[PDB]
Amino acid sequence: PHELESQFILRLPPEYASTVRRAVQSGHVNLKDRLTIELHPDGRHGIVRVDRVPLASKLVDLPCVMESLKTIDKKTFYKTADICQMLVSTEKKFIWNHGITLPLKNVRKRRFRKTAKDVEKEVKRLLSTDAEAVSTRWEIIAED
Amino acid sequence: RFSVAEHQERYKEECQRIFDLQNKVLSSTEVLSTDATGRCLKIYRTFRDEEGKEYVRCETVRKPAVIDAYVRIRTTKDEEFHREEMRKERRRIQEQLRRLKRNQEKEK
Numbered sequence: 376p377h378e379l380e381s382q383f384i385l386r387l388p389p390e391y392a393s394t395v396r397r398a399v400q401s402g403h404v405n406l407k408d409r410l411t412i413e414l415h416p417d418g419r420h421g422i423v424r425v426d427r428v429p430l431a432s433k434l435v436d437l438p439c440v441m442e443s444l445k446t447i448d449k450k451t452f453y454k455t456a457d458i459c460q461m462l463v464s465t466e467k468k469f470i471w472n473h474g475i476t477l478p479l480k481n482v483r484k485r486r487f488r489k490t491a492k493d494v495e496k497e498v499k500r501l502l503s504t505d506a507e508a509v510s511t512r513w514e515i516i517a518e519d
Numbered sequence: 520r521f522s523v524a525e526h527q528e529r530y531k532e533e534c535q536r537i538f539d540l541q542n543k544v545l546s547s548t549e550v551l552s553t554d555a556t557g558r559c560l561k562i563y564r565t566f567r568d569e570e571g572k573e574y575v576r577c578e579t580v581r582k583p584a585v586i587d588a589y590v591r592i593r594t595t596k597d598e599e600f601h602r603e604e605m606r607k608e609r610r611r612i613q614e615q616l617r618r619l620k621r622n623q624e625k626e627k
Contacts, residue, residue, distance in 0.1 A: 473553070477547070477548050477549070477550065477551070478544060478545050478546070478547050478548075478551075480550075480551035480552075480553070481551060481553065481554045484554060485554075491584075492584060492587055494582065494584045494585050494588060495588060497582075497585055498585055498588040498589050498592070501562070501578075501580075501585070501589055502589075502592060504564060505562070505564065507566065508564040508565055508566050509565045509566065509567070510563075510564075510565035510575075511562060511563065511564060511565075512562070512563035513560070513561070513562055513563070513593075514561060515556065515558040515559075515560060516558055516559050516560070516561050516579070517557075517558060
Protein backbone atom coordinates (compact mmCIF):
# COMPACT_ATOMS: atom_id res chain seq x y z
CA PRO A 376 0.00 0.00 0.00
CA HIS A 377 0.97 3.72 -0.02
CA GLU A 378 1.14 5.86 3.16
CA LEU A 379 0.81 9.66 2.75
CA GLU A 380 4.16 11.28 3.68
CA SER A 381 4.14 13.43 6.81
CA GLN A 382 5.97 16.72 6.35
CA PHE A 383 6.46 19.27 9.11
CA ILE A 384 8.50 22.45 9.52
CA LEU A 385 11.61 22.61 11.74
CA ARG A 386 12.45 26.00 13.25
CA LEU A 387 15.93 26.38 14.72
CA PRO A 388 17.76 29.15 16.58
CA PRO A 389 19.32 31.53 14.04
CA GLU A 390 23.00 30.59 14.44
CA TYR A 391 22.11 26.89 14.46
CA ALA A 392 19.81 27.53 11.51
CA SER A 393 22.73 29.04 9.62
CA THR A 394 24.96 26.03 10.33
CA VAL A 395 22.19 23.59 9.33
CA ARG A 396 21.49 25.62 6.17
CA ARG A 397 25.16 25.61 5.16
CA ALA A 398 25.37 21.87 5.77
CA VAL A 399 22.17 21.21 3.78
CA GLN A 400 23.28 23.30 0.79
CA SER A 401 26.68 21.59 0.91
CA GLY A 402 25.02 18.22 0.40
CA HIS A 403 27.45 15.69 1.98
CA VAL A 404 26.26 12.89 4.34
CA ASN A 405 28.36 14.67 7.02
CA LEU A 406 25.11 16.59 7.80
CA LYS A 407 23.38 13.24 8.54
CA ASP A 408 25.70 12.60 11.54
CA ARG A 409 25.52 16.30 12.62
CA LEU A 410 21.72 16.69 12.67
CA THR A 411 19.54 14.28 14.68
CA ILE A 412 15.95 14.46 15.97
CA GLU A 413 14.67 12.63 19.07
CA LEU A 414 10.89 12.83 19.66
CA HIS A 415 9.78 12.06 23.21
CA PRO A 416 6.80 9.79 24.05
CA ASP A 417 4.87 12.87 25.16
CA GLY A 418 4.45 13.54 21.45
CA ARG A 419 4.89 17.29 21.89
CA HIS A 420 8.48 17.42 23.15
CA GLY A 421 11.83 16.67 21.62
CA ILE A 422 15.52 17.29 21.23
CA VAL A 423 17.04 18.47 18.00
CA ARG A 424 20.81 17.91 18.18
CA VAL A 425 22.79 20.24 15.85
CA ASP A 426 26.52 19.25 15.74
CA ARG A 427 25.82 17.05 18.83
CA VAL A 428 24.55 20.14 20.76
CA PRO A 429 21.10 19.39 22.32
CA LEU A 430 18.25 21.95 21.79
CA ALA A 431 14.82 21.73 23.45
CA SER A 432 11.91 21.28 21.09
CA LYS A 433 8.14 21.51 21.09
CA LEU A 434 5.85 20.25 18.35
CA VAL A 435 3.19 22.93 17.96
CA ASP A 436 0.02 23.25 15.88
CA LEU A 437 -0.05 25.94 13.27
CA PRO A 438 -3.11 28.19 12.88
CA CYS A 439 -3.31 28.09 9.08
CA VAL A 440 -2.94 25.08 6.79
CA MET A 441 0.05 24.89 4.48
CA GLU A 442 0.41 22.60 1.48
CA SER A 443 3.61 21.51 -0.25
CA LEU A 444 3.34 21.86 -4.02
CA LYS A 445 5.89 20.28 -6.34
CA THR A 446 6.47 21.12 -9.97
CA ILE A 447 8.49 20.04 -12.97
CA ASP A 448 7.88 22.98 -15.34
CA LYS A 449 7.00 25.79 -12.84
CA LYS A 450 3.59 26.23 -14.49
CA THR A 451 1.53 23.33 -13.08
CA PHE A 452 1.88 22.47 -9.39
CA TYR A 453 0.88 19.19 -7.75
CA LYS A 454 -0.06 19.06 -4.08
CA THR A 455 2.17 16.63 -2.20
CA ALA A 456 1.25 17.00 1.49
CA ASP A 457 -0.49 19.11 4.13
CA ILE A 458 1.65 20.80 6.78
CA CYS A 459 0.10 21.77 10.10
CA GLN A 460 2.89 21.23 12.63
CA MET A 461 6.18 22.83 13.52
CA LEU A 462 9.03 21.55 15.72
CA VAL A 463 10.21 24.93 17.16
CA SER A 464 13.56 24.52 18.97
CA THR A 465 15.51 26.75 21.42
CA GLU A 466 -2.68 21.88 25.10
CA LYS A 467 -2.68 25.73 24.97
CA LYS A 468 1.17 25.73 24.99
CA PHE A 469 1.26 23.38 21.94
CA ILE A 470 -0.88 25.81 19.86
CA TRP A 471 1.05 28.47 17.84
CA ASN A 472 -0.84 31.76 17.40
CA HIS A 473 1.23 33.23 14.55
CA GLY A 474 1.59 32.04 10.98
CA ILE A 475 4.87 31.39 9.17
CA THR A 476 4.72 34.30 6.73
CA LEU A 477 5.21 37.92 7.75
CA PRO A 478 1.62 39.14 6.94
CA LEU A 479 0.18 36.36 9.08
CA LYS A 480 1.07 37.36 12.63
CA ASN A 481 -1.47 37.09 15.47
CA VAL A 482 -3.69 35.38 12.80
CA ARG A 483 -5.48 33.19 15.37
CA LYS A 484 -6.33 36.26 17.52
CA ARG A 485 -7.11 38.84 14.76
CA ARG A 486 -7.55 37.34 11.24
CA PHE A 487 -9.55 34.28 12.40
CA ARG A 488 -13.38 34.47 12.73
CA LYS A 489 -14.38 32.74 16.00
CA THR A 490 -17.74 30.89 16.31
CA ALA A 491 -18.64 29.17 19.63
CA LYS A 492 -21.78 27.80 21.38
CA ASP A 493 -11.94 17.96 25.09
CA VAL A 494 -15.37 19.23 26.34
CA GLU A 495 -17.10 16.38 24.42
CA LYS A 496 -14.68 13.83 26.02
CA GLU A 497 -15.44 15.30 29.50
CA VAL A 498 -19.22 14.97 28.78
CA LYS A 499 -18.66 11.31 27.71
CA ARG A 500 -16.74 10.65 30.99
CA LEU A 501 -19.64 12.25 32.96
CA LEU A 502 -22.17 10.02 31.11
CA SER A 503 -20.01 6.93 31.92
CA THR A 504 -19.93 7.93 35.64
CA ASP A 505 -23.77 8.37 35.58
CA ALA A 506 -24.09 4.86 34.03
CA GLU A 507 -21.78 3.26 36.67
CA ALA A 508 -23.93 4.93 39.36
CA VAL A 509 -27.35 4.02 40.84
CA SER A 510 -29.24 7.32 41.52
CA THR A 511 -28.57 10.66 39.71
CA ARG A 512 -29.95 14.04 40.98
CA TRP A 513 -29.65 17.19 38.79
CA GLU A 514 -30.66 20.89 39.12
CA ILE A 515 -29.65 23.95 37.00
CA ILE A 516 -28.37 26.19 39.77
CA ALA A 517 -27.92 29.83 40.77
CA GLU A 518 -25.15 31.67 42.65
CA ASP A 519 -23.88 29.44 45.47
CA ARG B 520 -35.04 56.36 -4.79
CA PHE B 521 -32.66 54.32 -6.98
CA SER B 522 -33.32 50.55 -6.90
CA VAL B 523 -30.91 49.73 -9.82
CA ALA B 524 -27.63 51.60 -10.60
CA GLU B 525 -27.22 52.80 -6.98
CA HIS B 526 -27.24 49.28 -5.46
CA GLN B 527 -25.16 47.79 -8.26
CA GLU B 528 -22.44 50.54 -8.13
CA ARG B 529 -22.35 50.50 -4.34
CA TYR B 530 -21.75 46.73 -4.34
CA LYS B 531 -19.09 47.11 -7.06
CA GLU B 532 -17.14 49.81 -5.23
CA GLU B 533 -17.25 47.93 -1.93
CA CYS B 534 -15.90 44.92 -3.84
CA GLN B 535 -12.96 46.92 -5.29
CA ARG B 536 -12.20 48.45 -1.94
CA ILE B 537 -12.09 45.06 -0.14
CA PHE B 538 -10.07 43.44 -2.92
CA ASP B 539 -7.49 46.30 -2.71
CA LEU B 540 -7.31 46.24 1.15
CA GLN B 541 -6.71 42.46 1.15
CA ASN B 542 -4.02 42.69 -1.52
CA LYS B 543 -2.14 45.32 0.44
CA VAL B 544 -2.37 43.67 3.87
CA LEU B 545 -1.36 40.26 2.55
CA SER B 546 1.62 41.42 0.47
CA SER B 547 2.92 43.58 3.40
CA THR B 548 6.50 42.58 4.37
CA GLU B 549 6.15 44.92 7.40
CA VAL B 550 6.94 43.11 10.70
CA LEU B 551 3.85 42.85 12.99
CA SER B 552 4.46 43.07 16.78
CA THR B 553 3.42 40.01 18.85
CA ASP B 554 0.32 41.04 20.88
CA ALA B 555 -28.24 33.18 28.97
CA THR B 556 -29.65 32.01 32.31
CA GLY B 557 -26.34 32.49 34.19
CA ARG B 558 -26.94 28.99 35.65
CA CYS B 559 -24.28 26.30 36.42
CA LEU B 560 -25.01 22.51 36.43
CA LYS B 561 -24.63 20.29 39.57
CA ILE B 562 -24.92 16.43 39.47
CA TYR B 563 -25.39 14.06 42.48
CA ARG B 564 -24.08 10.49 41.91
CA THR B 565 -24.86 7.43 44.13
CA PHE B 566 -22.42 4.45 43.98
CA ARG B 567 -21.55 1.32 46.04
CA ASP B 568 -17.94 0.96 47.36
CA GLU B 569 -16.09 -2.41 47.84
CA GLU B 570 -17.45 -4.53 50.77
CA GLY B 571 -20.55 -2.51 51.80
CA LYS B 572 -20.91 1.30 51.40
CA GLU B 573 -23.30 3.83 49.73
CA TYR B 574 -21.29 7.08 49.19
CA VAL B 575 -22.94 9.95 47.21
CA ARG B 576 -20.83 12.37 45.05
CA CYS B 577 -22.12 15.92 44.30
CA GLU B 578 -20.19 17.36 41.31
CA THR B 579 -20.73 20.94 39.99
CA VAL B 580 -20.01 21.79 36.30
CA ARG B 581 -19.29 25.55 35.85
CA LYS B 582 -18.31 25.13 32.16
CA PRO B 583 -21.35 26.24 30.10
CA ALA B 584 -19.98 24.24 27.15
CA VAL B 585 -19.95 20.98 29.13
CA ILE B 586 -23.42 21.93 30.38
CA ASP B 587 -24.97 22.23 26.91
CA ALA B 588 -23.61 18.90 25.65
CA TYR B 589 -24.50 17.10 28.87
CA VAL B 590 -28.12 18.28 29.10
CA ARG B 591 -28.76 17.73 25.34
CA ILE B 592 -28.12 13.97 25.77
CA ARG B 593 -30.49 13.65 28.78
CA THR B 594 -33.25 15.61 26.95
CA THR B 595 -32.63 13.26 24.02
CA LYS B 596 -32.48 10.13 26.19
CA ASP B 597 -35.61 11.40 27.96
CA GLU B 598 -37.35 11.39 24.57
CA GLU B 599 -35.49 8.24 23.48
CA PHE B 600 -37.85 6.17 25.63
CA HIS B 601 -30.11 -1.44 22.17
CA ARG B 602 -28.16 -4.69 22.84
CA GLU B 603 -31.14 -5.94 24.92
CA GLU B 604 -33.51 -5.11 22.02
CA MET B 605 -31.19 -6.99 19.58
CA ARG B 606 -31.27 -10.02 21.91
CA LYS B 607 -35.11 -9.74 22.00
CA GLU B 608 -35.15 -9.66 18.16
CA ARG B 609 -32.94 -12.84 18.09
CA ARG B 610 -35.40 -14.52 20.58
CA ARG B 611 -38.27 -13.49 18.22
CA ILE B 612 -36.46 -14.92 15.15
CA GLN B 613 -35.78 -18.14 17.16
CA GLU B 614 -39.50 -18.47 17.98
CA GLN B 615 -40.62 -17.69 14.40
CA LEU B 616 -38.22 -20.34 12.97
CA ARG B 617 -39.49 -22.96 15.47
CA ARG B 618 -43.09 -22.09 14.48
CA LEU B 619 -42.12 -22.46 10.76
CA LYS B 620 -40.50 -25.89 11.46
CA ARG B 621 -43.72 -26.94 13.33
CA ASN B 622 -45.71 -25.79 10.23
CA GLN B 623 -43.40 -27.91 8.01
CA GLU B 624 -43.97 -30.95 10.31
CA LYS B 625 -47.77 -30.37 10.13
CA GLU B 626 -47.60 -30.21 6.29
CA LYS B 627 -45.50 -33.42 6.00
